[PDB]
Amino acid sequence: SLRIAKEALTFDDVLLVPAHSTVLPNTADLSTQLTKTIRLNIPMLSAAMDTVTEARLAIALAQEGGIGFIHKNMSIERQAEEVRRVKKHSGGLRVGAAVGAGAGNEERVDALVAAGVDVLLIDSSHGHSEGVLQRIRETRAKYPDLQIIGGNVATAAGARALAEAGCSAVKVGIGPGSICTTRIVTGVGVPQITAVADAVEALEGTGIPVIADGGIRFSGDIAKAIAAGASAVMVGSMLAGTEESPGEIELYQGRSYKSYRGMGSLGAMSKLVPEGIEGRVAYKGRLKEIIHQQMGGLRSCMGLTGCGTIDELRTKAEFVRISGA
Amino acid sequence: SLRIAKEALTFDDVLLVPAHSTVLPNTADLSTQLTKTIRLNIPMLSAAMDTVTEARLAIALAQEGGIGFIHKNMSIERQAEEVRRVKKHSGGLRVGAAVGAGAGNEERVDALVAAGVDVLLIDSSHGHSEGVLQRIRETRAKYPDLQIIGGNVATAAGARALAEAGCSAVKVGIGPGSICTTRIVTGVGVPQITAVADAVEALEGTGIPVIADGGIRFSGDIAKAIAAGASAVMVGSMLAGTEESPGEIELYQGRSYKSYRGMGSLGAMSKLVPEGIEGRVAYKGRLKEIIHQQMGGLRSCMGLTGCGTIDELRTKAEFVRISGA
Amino acid sequence: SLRIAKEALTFDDVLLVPAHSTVLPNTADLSTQLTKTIRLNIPMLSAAMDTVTEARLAIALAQEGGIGFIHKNMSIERQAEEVRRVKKHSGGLRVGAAVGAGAGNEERVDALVAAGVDVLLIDSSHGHSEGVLQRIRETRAKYPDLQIIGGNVATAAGARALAEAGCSAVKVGIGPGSICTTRIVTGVGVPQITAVADAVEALEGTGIPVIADGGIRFSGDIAKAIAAGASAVMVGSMLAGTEESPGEIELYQGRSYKSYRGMGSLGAMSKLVPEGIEGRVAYKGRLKEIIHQQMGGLRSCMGLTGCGTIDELRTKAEFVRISGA
Amino acid sequence: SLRIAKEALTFDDVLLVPAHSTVLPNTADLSTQLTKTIRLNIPMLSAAMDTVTEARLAIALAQEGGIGFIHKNMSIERQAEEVRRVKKHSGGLRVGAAVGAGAGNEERVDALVAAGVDVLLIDSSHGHSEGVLQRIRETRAKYPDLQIIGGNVATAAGARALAEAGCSAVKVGIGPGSICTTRIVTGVGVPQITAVADAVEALEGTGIPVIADGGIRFSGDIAKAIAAGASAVMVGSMLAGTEESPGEIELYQGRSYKSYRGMGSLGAMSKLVPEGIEGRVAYKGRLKEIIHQQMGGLRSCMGLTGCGTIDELRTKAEFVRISGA
Ligand SMILES: C[C@@H](Oc1ccc2ncc3c(c2c1)CCOC3)c1cncc(-c2nc(Cl)c[nH]2)c1
Ligand SMILES: C[C@@H](Oc1ccc2ncc3c(c2c1)CCOC3)c1cncc(-c2nc(Cl)c[nH]2)c1
Ligand SMILES: C[C@@H](Oc1ccc2ncc3c(c2c1)CCOC3)c1cncc(-c2nc(Cl)c[nH]2)c1
Ligand SMILES: C[C@@H](Oc1ccc2ncc3c(c2c1)CCOC3)c1cncc(-c2nc(Cl)c[nH]2)c1
Ligand SMILES: O=c1[nH]cnc2c1ncn2[C@@H]1O[C@H](COP(=O)(O)O)[C@@H](O)[C@H]1O
Ligand SMILES: O=c1[nH]cnc2c1ncn2[C@@H]1O[C@H](COP(=O)(O)O)[C@@H](O)[C@H]1O
Ligand SMILES: O=c1[nH]cnc2c1ncn2[C@@H]1O[C@H](COP(=O)(O)O)[C@@H](O)[C@H]1O
Ligand SMILES: O=c1[nH]cnc2c1ncn2[C@@H]1O[C@H](COP(=O)(O)O)[C@@H](O)[C@H]1O
């Protein structure tokens, strides 16, 4: 018999239900616990991608109440300096940095901790791999108070494995990324709404938050991911093409564009087969206006569902399942 | 676990079932109770939109047996005068007018009642909000015999809240509008066929009619909304572009067009994020021919289902659920 | 609660299951009982449409083993003569003719019986209407041995009503036609695979055959309709544009075309609202080659399912339900 | 009642679930048992098609660890020589050859066995036909140790019939082929994921492997077919257009192309109605690079699911069912 574990739902399969409300959108509280010790003012994390987050974007997002993750596609010294630029900037801004879950990253981790990184991100395409869990346990043993985010997983067993390995937060997302091709390459993936809810249910009572990573296209997707139980979302394409993101602005016909590619694309890699594409994204302008629009959407959702806080949205808001029609 | 209340159906998910009939389409009775005191000759209400209903369109629709709703996107004096133009016109025509459910609308309400409004519409994007319910209770206490329509809701709890607050009729529709973007902006919405049936079931035995507002594209949608339990439908895009609607006729290539926009669009608003789009609709001609075609479709449905009255269509007609294919 | 009778399936929702077979496609028997007295060599009926069947097409199809139905969109004398042309032609060919189920058709019926019609077709868009049933009972009382086909219905109750009224065969199809717009105009319809199976189940043990009318696009649709329980299919678009069909061949760019329209289209009608469209269909050539291709498809199905006769296909062949993917 | 055996799933209906892993993609073992005596290094079989496999392609694939099947669309002497070219080539390469399941193929079979064929393929569009089973039983009685593959089937009963008739391996696939039109022509077919799992369940404990034949578009489809229980896959379009495939390279605008057609197409046939199309496929280059890319995809799947061997992927990997969205 076919080994079907369950049916799984994506953002477009569901809608949030309007409910009794004493919440006006302008009164909604967007603060969230990223970890037990780190509280963000907005539930936004920027992707650890070489076309998305470097010190400039990490500074702009932290200023909006979120947090950036400096990508690992650079030298140890360049990354430690990128972290130093964010930390040494005025305002007491928080920063995160990504590391590979393979052998020979102890040096990179030691440098980032010294540079003052607030949260270390163990960046894996398969968080349920034994090698990833081992590296996390080792990092936890060496740095007992360091805030660690481990990912990516898309199951209850995967979330429990990362929490047991020492993770301060668990990142969810196997195949939902706008630039992902793993569903076609490996045939592997879990629709994000089910992936998040499963990971959240597995971690109930532990105080370990879940980050919904990948596939956020609109502010409505942000709202859905949070009501599925995520404490925050991680975005790539939503912040790609912004002024603050790395790389140069390019002109095609008349419209301005920026590069956006998966970290598993042929370009980002230069022997695994690619699991990501290389694309062009339209120039979005300043990050501040993007965040204001998206958070505004989230605020209006909170008004419609009568959820005054992120925690209320996470635990009270209900969904309806819809057809393709 | 994912908090899925139920699966919800839209117009395209269902079809009406043909049944034994002694009803010829030309013999079908289209009259309906809008409220316990107001009976319409056709189950048609025009949308309270600045690109749809002003005195001219309200006069033409009332002449066809329906009722118009003068939009709130004007001064108090202009609106009271628009109501006076419809009331003072010969034929003893009925009119409705829309008001916001916020603070400082008591003055607008007093002026509309003085002008002779037959039905006051409390026009909210979220009828289940405490502020909306409070304003309704206050209006009911001040004007005990005034016919009041409150909306919008899309749940059984929302319909009960509006009926308990004093509403003479409840308006249903969260996200189905042709110009709506709330599903993408907030992630909130309820497919209209389920939304209507839920609200109708909640109000059974109360004598409070349900209005199906939004997403009516064809006469088949009208028939479906009524068999889902609605006593009448409210239409925006179906009457936009008609000769009688406000605004000027514009020429693009050779074809004539008129403006059609959500009341939550950037244009209609000029700090909430927009929940509606701004568009162009083809010039439809006289309202009379549109109503004759649409009511004709409804008449043929009534013949096919053997339902001689609106009340029979509401309570007897059955559906089949269909796939995307 | 929403009055959903059941889920209903169309041709594209299902596939036939291959089974043990001793049947080669060239050995399959395509003969079928249209009525208890009329046996056809192929399960094909041509539509009673003014762009499909007149004496020329009725002669060509009867020669292939099927039967034509002369449309009612002409004078009584012209129709009686069209029937006489088919009957008086050599080969002992069978013909059918269509009549409206309204008042003042007794004269048309008397003329067709005199002209030698083998099967009278009471042609209604709503066979479950009391007026249709009454006219059938009257025709049966006047002509006790006349083969009568009544339609259209799409339910078990509708099939039983027609069989009780005196029908020799029941025609199924509410909304499946390629040129139908009733689903959009009235919101009424039943997906054809469910409609046929329901009507067949209602008539089990009665010996009254079911005709699957409308929506046949490919030979695979023919096979599915028969395995759903239909004894024969009725086709419009499949035979439109053939050399033998009425009307003139028209040239557009370089390709040859013929007119194809619903009997409920504005053109075919010239006060009901139209329930059909007016279109152009590509010139198909001789009917003989179309029938050879389509029957060939049916033969290969019979080989794949191990069904040597139409009756075996009707009662033994199984389906699988498929998704949109 | 409608005779629906069950719902059936295709590749796009499912996704593989990531799981605990100690498997790195470079460490995955791709070897598989094609039969109890024949073990392949990669789970790849090339289609027995006149636009896909001749001696040149059969040599290149065997060199990669797979096996080719020389098509039957040639003379007995040409086919025996094509088999001799592969066998006599250095490296001790294995080859297969296809034969029709009709009368007068005993001569073709005797010649292929003499030429040194490692596996005889009884090539039928309907493996559950009595004629096919009879020819297999006869071949098994004459050549008791000859490795025989019989197909095609898409049910549990069909798999059991082929295994009982003497098949060393069973081939599954009724309608999934990229160039197949049987779903439209006959209305027959079974979605491949259900077809494979059903055939595998029927053959559990017998040691008779199942080959998933048809519809493989991406490496993700390969992974899914194997986790559905197939020991190997058979590919047509994936290897069409390669340098090693038969036929000439053609130039259209600037891009290079090769012919790809079903064996049931009008062209491949030159009295059954065609069940396949004739098309052009882009020139893919050397087979070696195609296999490296596709096997790489399979390796990454094995890493994601924690399945170190083909047998582990076949029996341990789980699926989630997804919607169209
Ligand atoms: C080619 C490259 O692809 C990526 C890179 C980054 C990703 N980042 C996040 C996600 C995915 C990613 C894929 C795919 C799943 O969804 C989330 C890659 C890099 N290193 C390891 C793998 C791998 N290991 C196993 Cl085991 C199977 N393949 C893949
Ligand atoms: C921007 C503007 O958008 C509209 C306007 C009119 C509407 N009229 C009807 C409907 C919708 C509408 C949206 C959306 C839901 O479906 C029906 C708006 C105006 N004032 C309040 C809101 C709001 N309050 C909460 Cl709380 C959340 N957002 C939204
Ligand atoms: C306009 C015209 O439309 C047709 C004509 C022929 C048809 N022939 C077959 C079918 C349909 C047809 C619709 C629609 C349903 O599917 C099968 C029409 C002609 N006379 C009566 C009706 C009618 N009576 C009720 Cl009561 C409701 N409307 C409709
Ligand atoms: C026209 C030709 O078509 C093919 C040829 C090769 C195929 N090879 C594999 C598959 C299919 C094929 C169809 C269709 C089903 O899926 C797999 C054909 C050749 N000889 C027999 C048949 C046949 N016999 C029965 Cl009985 C019904 N029709 C069909
Ligand atoms: O090449 C890749 N393949 C698959 N997923 C990737 C790749 N690179 C990054 N990702 C993921 O995709 C996310 C961005 O998704 P987006 O916001 O939908 O564009 C990142 O945060 C990663 O988890
Ligand atoms: O900006 C907006 N966003 C969402 N819904 C709106 C907006 N403006 C009006 N509506 C609703 O949409 C209805 C019109 O829907 P339509 O008939 O499908 O075009 C109105 O009666 C309102 O209930
Ligand atoms: O105007 C019309 N509307 C709806 N159905 C029609 C109309 N005219 C004919 N039909 C039906 O459509 C059938 C033809 O369907 P087709 O074979 O799919 O084109 C006829 O046999 C009638 O039952
Ligand atoms: O004409 C045909 N019709 C249907 N299936 C065919 C035909 N010719 C070959 N096939 C099947 O299609 C397979 C190739 O499928 P593909 O890999 O999806 O292109 C072959 O291995 C056969 O089983």
mmCIF file of N, CA and C in Angstrom, chain B residues 9 15-22 25 193 197 201 218-220 223-224 227 292-293 296-297 300-301 303-305 313-323 325, chain C residues 1-10 12-13 125-126 128-131 133 153-155 174 182-191 194 271-275 321:
data_model
loop_
_atom_site.group_PDB
_atom_site.id
_atom_site.type_symbol
_atom_site.label_atom_id
_atom_site.label_comp_id
_atom_site.label_asym_id
_atom_site.label_seq_id
_atom_site.Cartn_x
_atom_site.Cartn_y
_atom_site.Cartn_z
ATOM 1 N N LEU B 9 -17.077 26.623 0.638
ATOM 2 C CA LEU B 9 -17.400 26.612 -0.789
ATOM 3 C C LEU B 9 -17.748 27.967 -1.371
ATOM 4 N N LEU B 15 -23.356 23.486 -8.199
ATOM 5 C CA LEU B 15 -24.352 23.671 -9.245
ATOM 6 C C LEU B 15 -25.684 23.321 -8.648
ATOM 7 N N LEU B 16 -26.750 23.979 -9.127
ATOM 8 C CA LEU B 16 -28.114 23.714 -8.677
ATOM 9 C C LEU B 16 -28.701 22.509 -9.401
ATOM 10 N N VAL B 17 -29.490 21.726 -8.687
ATOM 11 C CA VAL B 17 -30.039 20.484 -9.224
ATOM 12 C C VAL B 17 -31.413 20.709 -9.868
ATOM 13 N N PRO B 18 -31.627 20.248 -11.125
ATOM 14 C CA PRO B 18 -32.977 20.387 -11.718
ATOM 15 C C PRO B 18 -33.982 19.480 -10.984
ATOM 16 N N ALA B 19 -35.243 19.935 -10.847
ATOM 17 C CA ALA B 19 -36.228 19.163 -10.102
ATOM 18 C C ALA B 19 -37.599 19.232 -10.763
ATOM 19 N N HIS B 20 -38.527 18.395 -10.282
ATOM 20 C CA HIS B 20 -39.912 18.412 -10.757
ATOM 21 C C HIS B 20 -40.427 19.860 -10.746
ATOM 22 N N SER B 21 -41.064 20.290 -11.843
ATOM 23 C CA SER B 21 -41.510 21.665 -11.926
ATOM 24 C C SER B 21 -42.873 21.850 -12.583
ATOM 25 N N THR B 22 -43.690 22.752 -12.001
ATOM 26 C CA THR B 22 -44.964 23.226 -12.567
ATOM 27 C C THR B 22 -44.775 24.723 -12.832
ATOM 28 N N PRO B 25 -40.658 29.811 -16.552
ATOM 29 C CA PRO B 25 -39.868 30.991 -16.140
ATOM 30 C C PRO B 25 -40.621 32.331 -16.100
ATOM 31 N N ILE B 193 -20.556 30.996 -0.668
ATOM 32 C CA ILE B 193 -21.665 30.047 -0.529
ATOM 33 C C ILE B 193 -21.747 29.526 0.929
ATOM 34 N N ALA B 197 -24.801 30.483 3.836
ATOM 35 C CA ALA B 197 -25.546 29.388 4.461
ATOM 36 C C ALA B 197 -25.360 29.388 5.989
ATOM 37 N N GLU B 201 -28.431 29.940 8.582
ATOM 38 C CA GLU B 201 -28.708 28.914 9.595
ATOM 39 C C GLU B 201 -28.735 29.559 10.995
ATOM 40 N N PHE B 218 -22.400 36.517 -12.640
ATOM 41 C CA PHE B 218 -23.448 36.064 -13.552
ATOM 42 C C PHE B 218 -24.751 35.828 -12.816
ATOM 43 N N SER B 219 -25.868 35.695 -13.577
ATOM 44 C CA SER B 219 -27.194 35.446 -13.004
ATOM 45 C C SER B 219 -27.234 34.094 -12.266
ATOM 46 N N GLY B 220 -26.388 33.157 -12.691
ATOM 47 C CA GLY B 220 -26.229 31.862 -12.048
ATOM 48 C C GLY B 220 -25.739 32.028 -10.615
ATOM 49 N N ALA B 223 -28.769 33.117 -8.375
ATOM 50 C CA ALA B 223 -29.571 31.933 -8.105
ATOM 51 C C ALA B 223 -28.926 31.096 -6.973
ATOM 52 N N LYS B 224 -27.603 30.871 -7.056
ATOM 53 C CA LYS B 224 -26.855 30.095 -6.062
ATOM 54 C C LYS B 224 -26.881 30.765 -4.688
ATOM 55 N N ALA B 227 -30.414 30.275 -3.221
ATOM 56 C CA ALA B 227 -30.619 28.899 -2.765
ATOM 57 C C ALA B 227 -29.716 28.556 -1.551
ATOM 58 N N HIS B 292 -33.084 43.151 -16.878
ATOM 59 C CA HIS B 292 -33.916 42.220 -17.631
ATOM 60 C C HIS B 292 -33.176 40.923 -17.950
ATOM 61 N N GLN B 293 -31.908 41.009 -18.404
ATOM 62 C CA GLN B 293 -31.087 39.832 -18.719
ATOM 63 C C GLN B 293 -30.840 38.968 -17.469
ATOM 64 N N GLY B 296 -33.997 37.436 -15.969
ATOM 65 C CA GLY B 296 -34.362 36.391 -16.922
ATOM 66 C C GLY B 296 -33.645 35.086 -16.611
ATOM 67 N N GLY B 297 -32.351 35.182 -16.274
ATOM 68 C CA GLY B 297 -31.516 34.040 -15.880
ATOM 69 C C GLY B 297 -32.040 33.368 -14.624
ATOM 70 N N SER B 300 -35.337 31.512 -15.340
ATOM 71 C CA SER B 300 -35.085 30.208 -15.938
ATOM 72 C C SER B 300 -34.578 29.214 -14.910
ATOM 73 N N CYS B 301 -33.824 29.697 -13.901
ATOM 74 C CA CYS B 301 -33.371 28.817 -12.807
ATOM 75 C C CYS B 301 -34.582 28.299 -12.022
ATOM 76 N N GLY B 303 -37.646 28.007 -13.010
ATOM 77 C CA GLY B 303 -38.316 27.003 -13.834
ATOM 78 C C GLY B 303 -37.654 25.637 -13.726
ATOM 79 N N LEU B 304 -36.306 25.584 -13.851
ATOM 80 C CA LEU B 304 -35.508 24.358 -13.757
ATOM 81 C C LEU B 304 -35.565 23.642 -12.389
ATOM 82 N N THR B 305 -35.644 24.421 -11.297
ATOM 83 C CA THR B 305 -35.683 23.874 -9.918
ATOM 84 C C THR B 305 -37.122 23.704 -9.352
ATOM 85 N N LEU B 313 -37.071 29.028 -3.615
ATOM 86 C CA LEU B 313 -35.675 28.904 -4.075
ATOM 87 C C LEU B 313 -34.700 28.835 -2.869
ATOM 88 N N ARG B 314 -34.901 29.744 -1.875
ATOM 89 C CA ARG B 314 -34.140 29.834 -0.617
ATOM 90 C C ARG B 314 -34.183 28.553 0.222
ATOM 91 N N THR B 315 -35.334 27.857 0.250
ATOM 92 C CA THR B 315 -35.540 26.732 1.163
ATOM 93 C C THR B 315 -35.662 25.346 0.546
ATOM 94 N N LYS B 316 -35.966 25.237 -0.763
ATOM 95 C CA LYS B 316 -36.171 23.936 -1.400
ATOM 96 C C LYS B 316 -35.036 23.501 -2.344
ATOM 97 N N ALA B 317 -34.495 24.425 -3.167
ATOM 98 C CA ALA B 317 -33.475 24.070 -4.178
ATOM 99 C C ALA B 317 -32.218 23.414 -3.572
ATOM 100 N N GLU B 318 -31.759 22.323 -4.212
ATOM 101 C CA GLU B 318 -30.595 21.519 -3.804
ATOM 102 C C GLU B 318 -29.394 21.777 -4.716
ATOM 103 N N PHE B 319 -28.178 21.520 -4.185
ATOM 104 C CA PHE B 319 -26.902 21.656 -4.901
ATOM 105 C C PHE B 319 -26.184 20.310 -5.071
ATOM 106 N N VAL B 320 -25.234 20.257 -6.011
ATOM 107 C CA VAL B 320 -24.283 19.140 -6.131
ATOM 108 C C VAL B 320 -22.964 19.828 -6.017
ATOM 109 N N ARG B 321 -21.982 19.190 -5.393
ATOM 110 C CA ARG B 321 -20.628 19.735 -5.324
ATOM 111 C C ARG B 321 -19.863 19.195 -6.552
ATOM 112 N N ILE B 322 -19.115 20.063 -7.232
ATOM 113 C CA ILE B 322 -18.360 19.645 -8.424
ATOM 114 C C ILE B 322 -16.841 19.846 -8.206
ATOM 115 N N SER B 323 -16.027 19.138 -8.988
ATOM 116 C CA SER B 323 -14.566 19.259 -8.910
ATOM 117 C C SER B 323 -14.116 20.446 -9.788
ATOM 118 N N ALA B 325 -12.607 20.082 -12.538
ATOM 119 C CA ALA B 325 -12.840 19.548 -13.877
ATOM 120 C C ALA B 325 -14.311 19.664 -14.233
ATOM 121 N N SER C 1 -28.149 24.820 7.061
ATOM 122 C CA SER C 1 -27.032 24.101 6.443
ATOM 123 C C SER C 1 -27.183 24.045 4.923
ATOM 124 N N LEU C 2 -26.047 24.083 4.212
ATOM 125 C CA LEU C 2 -26.049 24.055 2.747
ATOM 126 C C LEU C 2 -26.663 22.736 2.239
ATOM 127 N N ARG C 3 -27.706 22.812 1.373
ATOM 128 C CA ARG C 3 -28.411 21.630 0.856
ATOM 129 C C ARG C 3 -27.648 20.928 -0.298
ATOM 130 N N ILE C 4 -26.507 20.283 0.029
ATOM 131 C CA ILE C 4 -25.695 19.545 -0.955
ATOM 132 C C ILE C 4 -26.135 18.098 -0.972
ATOM 133 N N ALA C 5 -26.805 17.707 -2.062
ATOM 134 C CA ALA C 5 -27.317 16.352 -2.296
ATOM 135 C C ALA C 5 -26.192 15.307 -2.352
ATOM 136 N N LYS C 6 -25.042 15.667 -2.986
ATOM 137 C CA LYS C 6 -23.892 14.788 -3.216
ATOM 138 C C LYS C 6 -22.815 15.489 -4.040
ATOM 139 N N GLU C 7 -21.655 14.840 -4.186
ATOM 140 C CA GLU C 7 -20.612 15.316 -5.089
ATOM 141 C C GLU C 7 -20.958 14.686 -6.465
ATOM 142 N N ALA C 8 -20.679 15.381 -7.573
ATOM 143 C CA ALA C 8 -21.000 14.846 -8.902
ATOM 144 C C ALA C 8 -19.789 14.950 -9.813
ATOM 145 N N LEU C 9 -19.564 13.892 -10.626
ATOM 146 C CA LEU C 9 -18.402 13.706 -11.495
ATOM 147 C C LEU C 9 -18.681 13.890 -12.974
ATOM 148 N N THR C 10 -17.705 14.472 -13.678
ATOM 149 C CA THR C 10 -17.771 14.700 -15.121
ATOM 150 C C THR C 10 -16.780 13.752 -15.779
ATOM 151 N N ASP C 12 -13.854 14.139 -17.213
ATOM 152 C CA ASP C 12 -12.441 14.326 -16.868
ATOM 153 C C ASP C 12 -12.084 13.908 -15.429
ATOM 154 N N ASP C 13 -13.088 13.622 -14.576
ATOM 155 C CA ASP C 13 -12.846 13.190 -13.194
ATOM 156 C C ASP C 13 -12.482 11.741 -13.055
ATOM 157 N N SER C 125 -35.582 21.199 -22.728
ATOM 158 C CA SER C 125 -34.414 21.666 -21.970
ATOM 159 C C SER C 125 -34.627 21.320 -20.486
ATOM 160 N N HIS C 126 -35.868 20.881 -20.148
ATOM 161 C CA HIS C 126 -36.240 20.472 -18.800
ATOM 162 C C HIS C 126 -37.319 19.389 -18.804
ATOM 163 N N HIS C 128 -38.118 17.218 -16.603
ATOM 164 C CA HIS C 128 -38.814 16.968 -15.341
ATOM 165 C C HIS C 128 -39.989 17.939 -15.127
ATOM 166 N N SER C 129 -40.259 18.822 -16.114
ATOM 167 C CA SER C 129 -41.370 19.782 -16.098
ATOM 168 C C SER C 129 -42.681 19.005 -16.301
ATOM 169 N N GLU C 130 -43.736 19.364 -15.532
ATOM 170 C CA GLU C 130 -45.052 18.703 -15.580
ATOM 171 C C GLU C 130 -45.681 18.712 -16.973
ATOM 172 N N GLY C 131 -45.508 19.826 -17.690
ATOM 173 C CA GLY C 131 -45.981 20.005 -19.064
ATOM 174 C C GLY C 131 -45.407 18.976 -20.023
ATOM 175 N N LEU C 133 -44.113 15.915 -19.100
ATOM 176 C CA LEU C 133 -44.651 14.624 -18.688
ATOM 177 C C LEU C 133 -46.074 14.405 -19.217
ATOM 178 N N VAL C 153 -33.212 14.998 -18.621
ATOM 179 C CA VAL C 153 -33.156 14.940 -17.153
ATOM 180 C C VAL C 153 -31.701 14.704 -16.684
ATOM 181 N N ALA C 154 -31.438 14.823 -15.380
ATOM 182 C CA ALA C 154 -30.078 14.562 -14.885
ATOM 183 C C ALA C 154 -30.125 13.993 -13.474
ATOM 184 N N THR C 155 -31.297 13.439 -13.081
ATOM 185 C CA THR C 155 -31.487 12.861 -11.745
ATOM 186 C C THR C 155 -32.220 11.522 -11.841
ATOM 187 N N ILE C 174 -28.222 17.741 -18.487
ATOM 188 C CA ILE C 174 -28.584 19.086 -18.073
ATOM 189 C C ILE C 174 -27.258 19.823 -17.849
ATOM 190 N N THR C 182 -26.112 27.290 -19.691
ATOM 191 C CA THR C 182 -27.064 27.259 -18.571
ATOM 192 C C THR C 182 -26.350 27.295 -17.220
ATOM 193 N N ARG C 183 -25.122 26.713 -17.112
ATOM 194 C CA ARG C 183 -24.400 26.718 -15.840
ATOM 195 C C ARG C 183 -24.108 28.145 -15.399
ATOM 196 N N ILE C 184 -23.844 29.052 -16.347
ATOM 197 C CA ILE C 184 -23.561 30.454 -16.064
ATOM 198 C C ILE C 184 -24.856 31.301 -15.962
ATOM 199 N N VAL C 185 -25.846 31.028 -16.828
ATOM 200 C CA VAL C 185 -27.125 31.754 -16.900
ATOM 201 C C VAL C 185 -28.066 31.451 -15.703
ATOM 202 N N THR C 186 -28.299 30.167 -15.403
ATOM 203 C CA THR C 186 -29.234 29.738 -14.361
ATOM 204 C C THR C 186 -28.553 29.183 -13.113
ATOM 205 N N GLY C 187 -27.285 28.815 -13.242
ATOM 206 C CA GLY C 187 -26.561 28.199 -12.133
ATOM 207 C C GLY C 187 -26.892 26.727 -11.970
ATOM 208 N N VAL C 188 -27.692 26.157 -12.898
ATOM 209 C CA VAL C 188 -28.159 24.762 -12.880
ATOM 210 C C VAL C 188 -27.304 23.846 -13.780
ATOM 211 N N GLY C 189 -27.100 22.621 -13.312
ATOM 212 C CA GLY C 189 -26.386 21.572 -14.031
ATOM 213 C C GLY C 189 -25.993 20.384 -13.186
ATOM 214 N N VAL C 190 -25.793 19.237 -13.834
ATOM 215 C CA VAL C 190 -25.308 18.038 -13.170
ATOM 216 C C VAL C 190 -24.155 17.449 -14.013
ATOM 217 N N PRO C 191 -22.917 17.329 -13.455
ATOM 218 C CA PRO C 191 -21.825 16.627 -14.175
ATOM 219 C C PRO C 191 -22.302 15.258 -14.704
ATOM 220 N N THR C 194 -22.058 11.368 -13.251
ATOM 221 C CA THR C 194 -23.011 11.140 -12.154
ATOM 222 C C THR C 194 -24.483 11.152 -12.660
ATOM 223 N N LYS C 271 -40.392 34.964 -24.248
ATOM 224 C CA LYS C 271 -39.083 35.606 -24.413
ATOM 225 C C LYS C 271 -38.047 35.117 -23.368
ATOM 226 N N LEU C 272 -37.419 33.976 -23.667
ATOM 227 C CA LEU C 272 -36.406 33.384 -22.791
ATOM 228 C C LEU C 272 -35.019 33.981 -23.023
ATOM 229 N N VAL C 273 -34.212 34.060 -21.956
ATOM 230 C CA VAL C 273 -32.831 34.526 -22.071
ATOM 231 C C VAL C 273 -32.034 33.360 -22.733
ATOM 232 N N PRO C 274 -31.074 33.619 -23.647
ATOM 233 C CA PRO C 274 -30.354 32.494 -24.271
ATOM 234 C C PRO C 274 -29.631 31.588 -23.262
ATOM 235 N N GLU C 275 -29.589 30.280 -23.545
ATOM 236 C CA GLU C 275 -28.851 29.329 -22.707
ATOM 237 C C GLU C 275 -27.821 28.590 -23.558
ATOM 238 N N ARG C 321 -11.128 7.277 -9.754
ATOM 239 C CA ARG C 321 -11.316 8.724 -9.691
ATOM 240 C C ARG C 321 -9.909 9.360 -9.686
#
